């Protein structure tokens, strides 16, 4: 009913209410992706408030459709709107073109919804950076999306709290050759830096694009990779 825009321009030129929403997406727990030749891995730390919170009920990494998943930083409630939208865009695409949506198109449609919630009336921007990872005919993609609507493709990046120091550490480790089993190693080593307390199958969620599917690693498959690092 309040149809007036919340996001406006300051006299400096900047859209203040997005700088603040980007400050909100820079606050939540660290999550990060690493593109290999033969796949990508996104991992995030689901640091639960207490030990009583069922770890399996928390989800920091989501399947958007068979062939693409995402993670996020910042406001989980908000993210769960971009995700539930995206999941629709991935079906509504399948239905029309009988084809898994290209990540490129999927991220542009997520990007468009971030944009709507800057311009449009009586809504604040979303307080979450996505980190979409998936596979199309055009190979493997990692993409960051921001509250601005701006989206970058990356070879590897991080979002959340440790993300200035995780992107410093990811730059040294990363080589172009890097294969998926050495990437998952490299991704988990990056979380391990900024982590306080030990990592476990209940403490992190790892999703990986491999072959032509995205899948979240079951707590067994994660324990195998956590026993090596």
């Amino acid at each position: 009913e309040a149809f007036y825009g919340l996001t406006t321009f300051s006299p400096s030129g900047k859209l203040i209410q997005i700088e603040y929403a980007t400050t909100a997406a820079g606050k939540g727990t660290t999550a990060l992706g690493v593109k290999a030749t033969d796949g990508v891995v996104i991992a995030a730390k689901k640091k639960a408030p207490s030990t009583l919170v069922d770890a399996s009920s928390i989800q920091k990494v989501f399947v958007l459709d068979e062939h693409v998943g995402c993670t996020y930083s910042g406001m989980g409630p908000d993210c769960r709107v971009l995700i539930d939208s995206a999941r629709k865009n991935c079906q509504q695409y399948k239905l029309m073109y009988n084809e898994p949506i290209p990540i490129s198109q999927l991220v542009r449609k997520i990007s468009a919804i971030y944009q709507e919630f800057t311009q449009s009336g009586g809504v604040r921007p979303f307080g979450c950076s996505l980190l979409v990872a998936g596979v199309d005919a055009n190979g493997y993609h990692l993409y960051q999306v921001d509250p601005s609507g701006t989206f970058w493709a990356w070879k590897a990046t991080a979002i959340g709290t440790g993300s200035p120091d995780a992107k410093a550490f990811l730059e040294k480790r990363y080589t172009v050759d890097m294969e998926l089993e050495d990437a998952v190693h490299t991704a988990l080593l990056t979380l391990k830096e900024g982590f306080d307390g030990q990592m476990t199958s209940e403490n992190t969620q790892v999703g990986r694009v491999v072959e032509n599917r995205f899948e979240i690693l079951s707590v067994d498959q994660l324990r195998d990779y956590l026993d090596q690092i």
Partner: protein, 219 residues
């Protein structure tokens, strides 16, 4: 079309002819009438091929989206109820006559959705032109707690009635076993109608058909 389901002890077996007609013509001899709804739910379709395909897809989609939201295998009741409510809203104008087989936690489930939005959850079913001929073979031979082998050989038998004893059904029997664990879609489980007389290759050598103009474009 003639499509068939039976409940056997472990799960469901669906069956279909393959002949897709336009009027009194065979457009496609091998068309696949057993669509994927979900990993534990297949859905044969008779009636208007467009409507059967479109409804089936819209639901298979809806279920796949809902199977993320929950983090749970899609229940056959859910699939059924979406086909119902969709087909009812169109007063049967959407002329899709579906057999919806699957296996959830509750056990083997096999329905028909008639075009109007009627549902008959049953142990063995048929839809399409040849349904009546099939449902004869099914009523005669069906017994409870069949093995996967008996139940395929029956379904195949019941499709083969519709295939021969009806025109619109023909060619080969596709059969699909949905069990608790997996979904085996055997295409041409049975080819009764093989080739009678081998193709007499008429030889039209290049430069036969006279050509006024030509334009080649390289890539």
């Amino acid at each position: 079309t003639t499509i068939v389901g039976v409940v056997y002890r472990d799960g469901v077996v669906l069956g279909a002819d393959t002949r897709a007609t336009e009027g009194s013509i065979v457009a496609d001899k091998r068309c696949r009438k057993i669509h994927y709804m979900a990993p534990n739910i297949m859905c044969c379709g008779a009636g208007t091929s467009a409507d059967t395909e479109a409804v089936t897809n819209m639901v298979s989609s809806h279920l796949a989206l809902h199977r993320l939201e929950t983090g749970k295998q899609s229940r056959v009741l859910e699939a059924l109820t979406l086909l119902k409510r969709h087909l009812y809203r169109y007063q049967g104008h959407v002329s899709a006559a579906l057999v919806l087989g699957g296996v959830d936690v509750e056990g083997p489930f096999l329905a028909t959705i008639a075009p109007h939005g009627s549902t008959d959850r049953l142990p063995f079913v048929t839809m399409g032109s040849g349904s009546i001929a099939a449902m004869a073979q099914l009523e005669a031979a069906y017994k409870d707690n069949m093995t996967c082998e008996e139940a395929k050989e029956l379904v195949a038998s019941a499709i083969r009635k519709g295939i021969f004893n009806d025109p619109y059904s023909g060619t080969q029997v596709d059969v699909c076993v949905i069990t608790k664990d997996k979904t085996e879609l055997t295409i041409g489980y049975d080819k009764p109608n093989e080739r009678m007389y081998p193709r007499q290759e008429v030889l039209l050598p290049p430069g036969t058909t006279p050509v006024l103009k030509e334009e080649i474009r390289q890539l």
